[PDB]
Amino acid sequence: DSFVIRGDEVRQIAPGQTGKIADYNYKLPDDFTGCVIAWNSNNLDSKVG
Amino acid sequence: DSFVIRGDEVRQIAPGQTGKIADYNYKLPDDFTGCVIAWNSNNLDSKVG
Q1: Which stretches does the entry tag as region Integrin-binding motif (chains A, B)?
Q2: Which residue of A7, A12, A19, B42 sits 20 to 30 Å from the alpha carbon of B34, by its own alpha carbon?
């Protein structure tokens, strides 16, 4: 799975965690087997304006 | 004249200013006829690690 979120909302990508992303955007199962790999993408996704 | 500095040192690139960049690195004359251009390069010059 792949998506883009802000830095404060990275922690909501976790099993048994709440937030805007967990409730409304992306919910992990409470018993989840896998890896959450998040890296900063200022150079690729930001632009002036 | 092209160089890379910090964000907080951008205000030191001006005629008649003080600081580390103005005293030790790049000094602008008081009788300056010209333009100062400064753009953010977090995308291209910065690197994680």
Answers
A1: 6-8
A2: B42
| Token pair belonging to A30 | 């409470």
**Resolution of the solved structure (Å):** 3.6
- Determined by cryo-EM
Query: Which H or E element spans position A43?
Result: helix A42-45
Residue type, B22: A
Best of A40, A41, A43, A47 to substitute, by most chain B Cβ atoms within 10 angstroms, is A43
Asked if A46 has any chain B CB less than 8 Å from its own CB, the reply is yes
Instruction: Give just the sign of the alpha carbon dihedral B34, B39, B45, B48.
Output: positive
Distances A6 to A17, A22, A33, B12, B31 between C-alpha atoms, Å: 16, 14, 24, 32, 46
